[PDB]
């Protein structure tokens, strides 16, 4: 894979550490440009980290913290753009990678051989009692010319004194004791006021649009682009989607035009991303923009005619920006809502809260608000749910959890600590992006019965699961799917919970035969749904009772025939 | 003030070796980008090699690459050049030159006097000096000439002054000329007023350094 | 390899007249980062090392007077000298320091155009001291002349000596802009002692007709 999405967990103890290694692999393996923040936290000594090998670029910040690991192999990493920064100021953060209390553990050598560039932000290296050479580096050289206010705060306390760097290095400047870890300079050595260079001479100066240095003066030859890679060439802006006429200023669509996606000019946006009016590939539309689905591809954003007719916002958006959970003080905002622009979080607060005081608990019946809901643009998180409810049937008609905002930057569907006995998400047929985490739900069966592969939309995605009721003991009680669930796939017991109903449907229920020849109301079939006839159509003996729904389309009228209808 | 004095030139048989050494003074040597520029006799200037202030950046020309090795000792204000596997082509003056600001701009703003390096398997021989006795055949009016001829020496070069450097006005030492025998010859000459010929003494100071041959030769008129 | 072209190779001008030398480079020497061309100019005065005239293709060094001014851009440059003075004599070089390998141009030899000046002609027999050693060297001197071009003919008893005699000229003088010429006729002891009249004919533009200085062997 070319690109991957990063995270935003940021020093939080991961709620199931047994998963945590699997998540990092699924997310960062194969990938070369980490869009988001590269967060390697709470990693054990042994941890196989070979999946981080190919990382060349980090859009955001790099956080290596609370790790017992001997070394992290980010050797190919050439640039961090610092799109956001840890603790407001730090593009790189190496914190608390020791043993507190083979022989020792903790971070020994940094090994950032290639890390030539840090556009925005500073560096923070503290409390790493086996970390060496942190001292030696000329950090000033690594920061870009523009930010260079870019402060550093390096702590140098150790429990071993270190080797010197291999004498091959010019000054004592290295990422490790090996000769191949000498910190070759780029910025602070060049001729004139060069952005960056491959050597101290004028021919050795890089193009204005190169970033992490270069292998020659051309705009092709950059180790990374400052602004955008345009089909092999570094440029300041992508070719716009629309040319304008000399006189009229009409939209003459650019044959060679591209969209901005990260640091790349792109012919069309990736799967879950929204095409923008301006021509970007965003995950949330701009101000004065409306989310629209067109007949041409995915959803796109648009400059509105009227101050865009408001559509039901969720958490992490507009007036619920910094609310952590759906509670009894905002449950009735979601009434009647077909689609929620944002996310939903259910916490132990929401059901057992009275903290801040006076705010009443949510009742199980108040949750039926969401029965209308078909789509969530963001994530679903549930760390708490009432005991009385055995499932998440409230979200029965939830179909698409897109996850353009993901929990801790990773998890779209998060279910933890619940005591629900089956899932119930019977309409759920897509997980747009992000990982699914279902864990420590003591009672939950019907997890090994959902074909999660069919929900996912890119190879990074996966389900992670532990400490739920195991399917050996579920099937031990004899809890299979219902007969009529094709390929035995279901979200719970009974005939309502199939993913594909193998025969015929009656609203919720999967069914062998409709009531076309015998039964209570007589029924016409349409797209495998048993829909009743008009009630005033006559019941027939050994025959079809109607063409369709209405009274004009009966075989015979039961009481009065007055065309065009029966009555 | 600025001064670069180089040493260790002289004669080398083809295939052998030699080490030039340029001693710097009158600036902070640790903050300057040193180089060697050579000049074959009566030819243009050829860049040989360069080294940065801290020694962290080195370069060579393709004609010398592998054969030559540049180095410096900043503590001892000196620049070195290890020329191995020497050739007829390498025969030239070698000027030690300081650059401009450490390792960025190679202006070469101050140059040494330069050291001559000759590569030939023929051996060293010192000169003889013979007097070009003055023309009392010229006018007593009148202007008269005088000189001394340095003959049969190798390799180059020789210095030739007059009256231990005292007399210098109207003096013309020529450049050397190569002979059949593969030995150099040299005329050193001077214009004087014919009237002072009787009254004042004239002596040429010839110094051929390779052969340790220093001679001072008095120059007098013949009579009848 | 940024290959350096200089034109012309010879320049000869009267002092007070201006004069210029063009430098060309196979690849451009313009540096966008600091907006300057990365060329340098030198004067190698004869009997000296080179001195730096100009860096950045147009900025002078300390000591280098008003007359010297570099100009141009890109690949094509021109060193100019408004009002040439008699001491400016030398060879002028252009160097690039844009990149490895650091290259020079060939050089341009500038001659001072002095008024016409006939040579002072002298002749010197071989020393008795060398004569005993077995070889006899006869030297003819032409001192302080202009222009440089000058024929010198040796004759032993009217026999035109041709082949057995090497010349040498001085580099043009910084003070007076004259040249001086040596001519060294070599004979064996034996051959020197077969002949009576040795002679040295000069022809030169400063003379109204060829001049001859000639000693008779033995005769005071
Ligand atoms: C987990 O760590 C242990 C202990 O450090 C590793 O066992 C080491 O393995 C290496 C490589 O084979 C040996 O050279 C060490 O001497 C071993 N050390 C000890 C203390 O036993 C082991 O490789 C790791 N185990 C797993 C499953 O990754
Ligand atoms: C811009 O993107 C291109 C891909 O379109 C990158 O080029 C690839 O580099 C890999 C790495 O070895 C090669 O195997 C491919 O052959 C390259 N593909 C193409 C189409 O050139 C390139 O690295 C990017 N450039 C910059 C400056 O980031
Ligand atoms: C060691 O730790 C303390 C506490 O963080 C810090 O103030 C001190 O400066 C450190 N010592 C060195 C030598 O860096």
Author numbering:
A (entry chain A): 1 to 101, 110 to 575
B (entry chain H): 1 to 224
C (entry chain L): 1 to 220
Study text:
Finally, we determined the X-ray crystal structure of the HER2 extracellular domain bound by 39S Fab. There is one 39S Fab–HER2 complex in the asymmetric part of the unit cell. The conformational arrangement of HER2 subdomains is virtually identical to that determined in other studies of HER2 alone or in complex with trastuzumab and pertuzumab Fabs. 39S Fab binds to an epitope that includes the end of subdomain I and the beginning of subdomain II of HER2, spanning amino acids 197 to 216. That epitope is positioned in the shallow grove formed between CDRs H2 (H2–10−2 CDR–length combination) of heavy and L1 (L1-17-1) of light chains. Upon HER2 binding, about 660 Å2 of solvent-accessible area is sequestered. Three hydrogen bonds are detected between the heavy chain of 39S and HER2, all coming from CDR3 (H3-14-4). However, hydrophobic residues also contribute to a substantial portion of the interaction of both chains of 39S with HER2. Superimposition of the HER2–39S Fab complex structure with structures of HER1 and/or HER4 homodimers allowed us to confirm that the presence of 39S Fab prevents formation of both homo- and heterodimers. Thus, we postulate that the mechanism of action of mAb 39S relies on prevention of HER2 homo- or heterodimer formation.
The family of epidermal growth factor receptors consists of four members (HER1–4; 1), each of which contains an extracellular domain (comprised of four subdomains), a single-span transmembrane helix, and an intracellular kinase domain that can interact with signaling molecules. HER2 is the only promiscuous member of the family that can dimerize with any of the other family members and has no need for ligand binding (because it is always in a ligand-bound “open” conformation; 6). Dimerization results in the phosphorylation of tyrosine residues on the intracellular kinase domain, which, in turn, initiates a variety of signaling pathways. Recently, an anti-HER2, biparatopic, monospecific, tetravalent ADC, MEDI4276, was developed to treat a broad range of HER2-expressing metastatic breast cancers.
